Amino acid sequence: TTAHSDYEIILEGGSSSWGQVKGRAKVNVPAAIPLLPTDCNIRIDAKPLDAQKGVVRFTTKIESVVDSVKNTLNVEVDIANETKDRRIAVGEGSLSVGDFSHSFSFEGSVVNMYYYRSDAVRRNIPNPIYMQGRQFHDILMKVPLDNNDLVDTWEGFQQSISGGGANFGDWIREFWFIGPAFAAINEGGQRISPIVVNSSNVEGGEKGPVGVTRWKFSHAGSGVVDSISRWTELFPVEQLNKPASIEGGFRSDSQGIEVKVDGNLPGVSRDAGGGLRRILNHPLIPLVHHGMVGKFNDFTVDTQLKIVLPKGYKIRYAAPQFRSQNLEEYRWSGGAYARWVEHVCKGGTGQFEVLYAQ
Amino acid sequence: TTAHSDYEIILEGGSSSWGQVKGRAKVNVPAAIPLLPTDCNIRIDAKPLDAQKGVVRFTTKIESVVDSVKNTLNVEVDIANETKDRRIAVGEGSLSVGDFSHSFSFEGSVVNMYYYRSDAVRRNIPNPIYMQGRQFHDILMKVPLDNNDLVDTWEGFQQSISGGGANFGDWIREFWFIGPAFAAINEGGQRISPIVVNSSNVEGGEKGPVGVTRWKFSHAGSGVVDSISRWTELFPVEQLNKPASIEGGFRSDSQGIEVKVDGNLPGVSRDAGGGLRRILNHPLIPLVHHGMVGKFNDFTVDTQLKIVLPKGYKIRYAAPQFRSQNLEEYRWSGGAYARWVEHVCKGGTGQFEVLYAQ
Amino acid sequence: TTAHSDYEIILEGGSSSWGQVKGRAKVNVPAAIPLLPTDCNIRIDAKPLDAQKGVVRFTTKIESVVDSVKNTLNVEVDIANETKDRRIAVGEGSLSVGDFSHSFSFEGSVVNMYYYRSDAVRRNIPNPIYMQGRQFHDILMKVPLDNNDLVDTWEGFQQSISGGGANFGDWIREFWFIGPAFAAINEGGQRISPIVVNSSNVEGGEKGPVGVTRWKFSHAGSGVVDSISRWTELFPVEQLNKPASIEGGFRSDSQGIEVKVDGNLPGVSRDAGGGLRRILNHPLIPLVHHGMVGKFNDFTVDTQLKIVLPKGYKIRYAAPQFRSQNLEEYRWSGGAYARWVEHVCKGGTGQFEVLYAQ
Numbered sequence A, B, C: 001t002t003a004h005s006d007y008e009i010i011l012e013g014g015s016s017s018w019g020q021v022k023g024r025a026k027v028n029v030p031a032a033i034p035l036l037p038t039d040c041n042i043r044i045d046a047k048p049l050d051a052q053k054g055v056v057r058f059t060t061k062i063e064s065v066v067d068s069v070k071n072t073l074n075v076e077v078d079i080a081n082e083t084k085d086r087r088i089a090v091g092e093g094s095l096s097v098g099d100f101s102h103s104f105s106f107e108g109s110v111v112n113m114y115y116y117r118s119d120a121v122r123r124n125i126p127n128p129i130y131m132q133g134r135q136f137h138d139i140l141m142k143v144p145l146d147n148n149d150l151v152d153t154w155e156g157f158q159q160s161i162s163g164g165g166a167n168f169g170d171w172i173r174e175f176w177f178i179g180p181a182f183a184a185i186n187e188g189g190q191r192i193s194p195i196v197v198n199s200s201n202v203e204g205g206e207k208g209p210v211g212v213t214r215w216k217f218s219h220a221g222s223g224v225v226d227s228i229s230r231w232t233e234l235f236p237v238e239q240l241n242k243p244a245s246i247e248g249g250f251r252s253d254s255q256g257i258e259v260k261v262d263g264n265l266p267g268v269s270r271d272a273g274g275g276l277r278r279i280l281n282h283p284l285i286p287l288v289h290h291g292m293v294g295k296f297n298d299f300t301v302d303t304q305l306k307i308v309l310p311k312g313y314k315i316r317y318a319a320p321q322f323r324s325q326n327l328e329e330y331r332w333s334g335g336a337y338a339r340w341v342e343h344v345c346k347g348g349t350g351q352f353e354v355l356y357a358q
């Protein structure tokens, strides 16, 4: 069993954090999904809407097929920071599964709060990783009740909310995090609070009744959860001077997995201090979560990484070390790098640092 | 290190869901039990008691030896559905450990509740897997206090129940799910509620004092928990027109594991719609749980599966595909099937579907 | 990828439980730490202070370097049993990270409580492993507020304690168990209670203000947690007739891990009943926890174990069996022992029992 993969990063220079990213992998092992074949495509686009205010138009299109059933999700959302801790979003979208579909619109705010930050930590740790915190969501959402399936589900939830007392917001968590999603919460050192429902009402919309709910929850992390530890970094609106996009797809069945990713986006490199830059620290959640599925078959690694620096730049530090260099082009394969690839595919979070400069 | 295994399924035809199942495995790796050697035999029998009412007499006999200590458990229980959601049980049994034994009798009800089921899901998903829900237990149990060990433990629990307040039903969970059982709860996306004790009293039985307790708990699942997702299917009383039975045993120590299973029971095949039948979907809990121990030693797979269909039937779909066919007899070995066997032994839940018809 | 390791145990005879322990390992795989290189040294010393009262002076010195930042911790503590269930400690120490340091002093009590112990278990199980219980901590600690970082953090916590209500003692847990420590709690069948703060005040110390807090928590275990299951055994004060010490260090980076351990301490052997002695049962937590990192790279085992018995003693039982014997010296390598080493490095808890006698 051989895992074949290839990765490529092409960096912009100057004050830019942008890079082009490409990833390909193929491995002839069964996927762990208990319905196969399963295929999926995703595209995400972000464009500056109002750069003066810092408003970003963010879209996502997801299409999948699971055991022959076609699913889609489309969301269009306007996102902006109000403060360094508070972010707001306004959007709309739709979903479909087979012959069924429904739409939605929403307004929400998210507030990120770090627990007990200190100057003594900040000035002594040059590259901090684990930052603990809690993140509060406040959501208003509206869904037209425009078929009888929607009406039935609306009524079912009204009954539970009215009658279930404290149980409703507690027990909803095993409904929400379906299948193996529930176990993955603790695996990443994450916590999900009970849900609080502030109001749930039917409003008279233009084309009929609309189910309107305002609700809240928080989630917390011990530092592995990048959504909290890296709140600001994960939304690089200041560097979005042009549209960014990423596209990915996979095909899987009982005899293999194939995946492609292609993107162009800011945030791929970061200032590392003292004139040096680094490839951004690897986010941890993806490694930890994928780690829950990456140990089911033995494999050997056939993997190359190519990094193309801006003209005139040079790698100052890399561990594992690159295998070859041709001017600004650097390549990793085999040896220590292959062992690192095996490690992260199985859930390991060992650091691979790349530092570069002029 | 080679894992040798063999599985065989022989199906009944017509409207029958019955099959004979045989499994053998031998692998020369240490078991994970921190006391070795450990051996165990189990037999389960079910026979129709009152088919008109749908009452089943269910017995279980377990015998084990752990670090030279002999344990037994015998239970005889009458089980029936009252409704599609509520099931009742009345039974008695005994247990022994070394020189100690005690008996018990009980009456209980279990109510299964799915969370928010919908017509839009039902009509669009041809083979649903994850179904979230919660399952309520109501138990009355009676144990004769007929030696001083029983009396001592009774008193210890009375103290905790009386004095412990809300702590008792909370903290009992780490007592109940001894050793690695506690960690396995979250692993399967399962939740166990605190216990509620309604009453605990000494009654005057025929041959002396009897400790009588009525207590309740619920457990919930995000869909991996088959006890909830597949509540009806897991008790195929309608197909029990004759006695069913299964027998299994293992021997384990620090240099190997050997296991045998032999059974004859309904529910091995299921209607898949449109004239097709399938081997029942693989239950998930066993894979997930065994997965917690299946990754401690590298192994290669030496494994065959034989499925014998009823005369005149043919496989319509199988993935991974069978290696050979001789009329109604189909065999799997090597290649993609061997990779699938490795996958599920390590905790993977990738679908292996077998569809057959006339 | 080959893991090279060597272990050695040299036992004292007579009524002594003492042994010398040596361990070496080197493996060329990346460590999982998301900051590398990381190096660490630890020394622990225990000496009898007041043998008549059973007071032990316990010190620990830890020095580490993480991504070039130097950290230290020094603690000196006087420990004694008050009863078989209650232990007290009084100590002081300091820590430093880069340019920052702070000191502390504390007094604490810990009470271990087993859940529902029974005579029927005790007399029938010759070597019990899983013992469920809960362990209560009561801590008074004092920290001089002698720089502005300390003052700032003090104020931050005062705000949370005053304003946070029940949330403070709940949410502190994901702060406390930073990074992957949080996930490891459930993995070992462990539970940590919310913290209760009894008082938090500034006192006027000799050299300025001192932050004084009294707080409580408990932790519980289903039996894997050795701190609870083996409470008495883990503090063998009765056998400490001379100083004991252990020293360990590791070096790790993205291309390997190297580790050394050297110690001399009581508790290495134990009475097994009927004139036999055993090497102490393997503690489980270390195996379970290390197990969370031991599955990220395939490896083969190159490992030897040497046990040197007291003169005239002989091994009565060992499984896996030793490979060779030269009078009192016994050696394990390859075969079943190598498979056992692989097993425990990956998180397995299979028993390796060694029994010896005259």
Ligand code: BCL
Pocket (backbone or CB within 6 Å): A044, A045, A046, A060, A075, A077, A079, A080, A087, A088, A089, A091, A107, A108, A109, A110, A137, A138, A139, A219, A227, A228, A234, A235, A244, A245, A246, A263, A264, A265
């Ligand atoms: C994932 C970890 C956390 C979490 C972390 C965050 C973070 C972090 C943010 C939000 C924000 C939002 N969250 Mg939240 N959120 C969680 C769970 C939820 C749930 C739920 C029922 O589970 C809901 C209803 C919401 C609701 C919301 C909205 C109020 C808001 C915008 C969502 C959106 O546009 O999605 C549409 C997007 C998708 C459907 C797909 C997103 C897929 C992943 C996450 C994209 C990763 C980036 C990818 C690697 C790079 C893209 C580059 C492109 C070139 C641009 N969150 C979980 C528990 N949430 C954002 C906001 O603006 O708040 C005001 C925000 O900043």
Ligand code: BCL
Pocket (backbone or CB within 6 Å): A021, A023, A042, A046, A056, A058, A079, A226, A227, A230, A233, A234, A235, A236, A237, A240, A244, A246, A247, A248, A261, A263, A265, A266, A267, A268, A282, A283
């Ligand atoms: C509503 C969602 C949130 C949000 C949540 C997150 C989270 C959470 C993370 C990021 C991360 C990143 N985000 Mg952000 N992000 C948002 C908006 C943006 C915008 C923008 C201006 O709108 C931009 C340009 C970015 C850019 C970036 C990068 C700095 C970084 C990914 C680096 C990389 O190499 O990716 C290269 C990409 C790949 C190698 C793989 C891409 C795979 C596919 C195509 C996308 C991810 C799918 C995901 C795994 C599954 C989604 C399931 C949902 C149910 C749909 N985000 C909004 C506000 N973003 C990650 C990071 O490292 O942060 C420090 C991270 O963990």
Ligand code: BCL
Pocket (backbone or CB within 6 Å): A007, A008, A009, A021, A022, A023, A024, A040, A042, A062, A248, A249, A250, A259, A260, A261, A279, A280, A281, A282, A283, A286, A287, A290, A305, A341, A344, A345, A352, A354
């Ligand atoms: C199993 C493989 C590992 C993995 C293995 C590696 C390896 C090996 C390397 C990197 C490298 C990098 N990875 Mg990584 N990486 C993973 C997941 C992520 C995610 C993420 C949101 O999931 C992000 C933001 C990143 C980010 C990054 C950058 C820090 C860095 C440069 C980009 C690159 O080479 O990408 C390469 C692109 C990929 C590996 C593709 C990952 C696609 C993931 C699995 C998501 C697929 C989503 C799917 C198409 C749609 C899901 C839809 C839902 C089902 C609804 N990785 C997965 C979990 N990554 C490189 C590096 O460190 O350079 C210094 C490097 O050498």
Ligand code: BCL
Pocket (backbone or CB within 6 Å): B044, B045, B046, B060, B075, B077, B079, B080, B087, B088, B089, B091, B107, B108, B109, B110, B137, B138, B139, B219, B227, B228, B234, B235, B244, B245, B246, B263, B264, B265
């Ligand atoms: C296992 C997952 C759930 C669970 C799921 C279920 C399900 C599902 C059912 C019950 C039912 C019962 N449960 Mg419950 N139950 C759990 C934990 C408990 C605990 C406890 C202290 O942990 C108790 C006291 C009970 C108590 C009870 C009784 C009230 C009742 C009958 C039990 C019995 O006869 O057992 C005697 C049986 C055994 C000792 C061994 C059973 C071994 C396994 C489970 C058998 C699997 C089937 C095997 C693969 C195929 C057999 C084929 C044969 C040919 C017949 N449950 C856990 C949390 N429970 C049943 C009932 O009738 O309720 C009214 C029922 O339908």
Ligand code: BCL
Pocket (backbone or CB within 6 Å): B021, B023, B042, B046, B056, B058, B079, B226, B227, B230, B233, B234, B235, B236, B237, B240, B244, B246, B247, B248, B261, B263, B265, B266, B267, B268, B282, B283
């Ligand atoms: C009190 C227990 C509950 C109960 C709980 C469960 C649970 C829970 C499950 C089943 C499952 C099944 N049960 Mg039921 N089941 C009960 C009563 C019955 C009766 C009956 C008429 O009395 C019958 C005929 C069945 C029949 C069946 C099958 C439809 C199915 C197993 C298929 C298979 O291939 O097994 C072939 C068997 C094997 C390959 C392995 C057999 C191994 C040993 C011999 C038995 C299991 C031991 C178990 C792992 C450990 C027990 C530990 C306890 C502490 C004692 N059950 C009662 C009401 N049953 C499973 C399923 O798939 O459901 C959809 C499942 O997960």
Ligand code: BCL
Pocket (backbone or CB within 6 Å): B007, B008, B009, B021, B022, B023, B024, B040, B042, B062, B248, B249, B250, B259, B260, B261, B279, B280, B281, B282, B283, B286, B287, B290, B305, B341, B344, B345, B352, B354
């Ligand atoms: C580690 C191995 C995996 C496993 C690997 C496989 C493989 C490989 C195949 C199946 C197949 C099947 N398995 Mg499976 N299966 C497991 C456990 C289960 C359990 C269960 C209750 O534990 C059930 C109901 C099933 C059910 C089924 C059917 C869906 C299907 C046809 C029967 C068969 O071939 O059985 C074969 C019988 C076994 C594998 C024996 C399993 C015995 C388990 C581990 C329980 C032993 C209990 C022990 C003796 C007593 C415990 C006592 C307590 C300690 C008190 N499996 C374990 C966890 N299973 C086949 C299939 O998909 O056909 C289409 C197939 O090819």
Ligand code: BCL
Pocket (backbone or CB within 6 Å): C044, C045, C046, C060, C075, C077, C079, C080, C087, C088, C089, C091, C107, C108, C109, C110, C137, C138, C139, C219, C227, C228, C234, C235, C244, C245, C246, C263, C264, C265
């Ligand atoms: C680790 C599992 C449990 C736990 C289990 C125990 C046990 C068991 C005991 C204590 C005891 C104490 N605990 Mg506690 N304790 C935990 C978490 C905590 C936390 C915290 C913020 O997390 C705090 C503040 C405390 C506080 C305290 C003190 C009141 C007291 C003495 C500590 C000390 O001297 O440490 C200084 C020591 C260190 C900094 C390093 C210790 C490293 C490991 C644990 C040493 C293992 C032994 C090694 C293998 C063999 C050494 C041989 C040498 C030759 C001597 N515990 C966790 C949850 N705690 C002890 C006591 O005397 O109570 C009155 C005691 O007996």
Ligand code: BCL
Pocket (backbone or CB within 6 Å): C021, C023, C042, C046, C056, C058, C079, C226, C227, C230, C233, C234, C235, C236, C237, C240, C244, C246, C247, C248, C261, C263, C265, C266, C267, C268, C282, C283
């Ligand atoms: C405050 C801490 C507690 C305490 C908590 C524990 C815990 C918890 C455990 C022990 C264990 C043991 N302890 Mg004690 N122990 C204390 C005081 C003592 C004293 C004493 C007279 O002061 C002595 C002589 C001992 C002796 C012993 C042995 C009986 C046994 C280890 C056997 C072995 O082979 O180790 C040989 C050692 C090695 C092979 C590895 C040594 C590695 C390094 C050098 C030390 C451990 C570091 C640890 C992994 C990480 C610490 C992280 C902290 C954040 C600093 N402890 C105090 C009271 N002790 C263990 C056991 O098996 O108990 C049954 C165990 O799990």
Ligand code: BCL
Pocket (backbone or CB within 6 Å): C007, C008, C009, C021, C022, C023, C024, C040, C042, C062, C248, C249, C250, C259, C260, C261, C279, C280, C281, C282, C283, C286, C287, C290, C305, C341, C344, C345, C352, C354
């Ligand atoms: C990954 C390897 C496994 C492991 C694999 C083995 C193997 C294999 C054998 C033993 C054996 C034994 N082990 Mg062990 N053992 C582990 C951890 C422990 C710990 C502990 C507190 O962590 C203890 C008390 C013990 C105790 C014991 C005795 C029961 C027994 C005889 C001593 C010996 O040979 O030591 C050998 C010494 C070691 C294996 C070194 C372990 C060092 C651990 C990993 C801690 C390092 C701490 C580090 C230096 C500092 C951390 C600082 C913090 C980051 C702040 N092991 C780790 C997790 N152990 C032998 C036995 O069973 O004889 C009958 C045997 O053959």
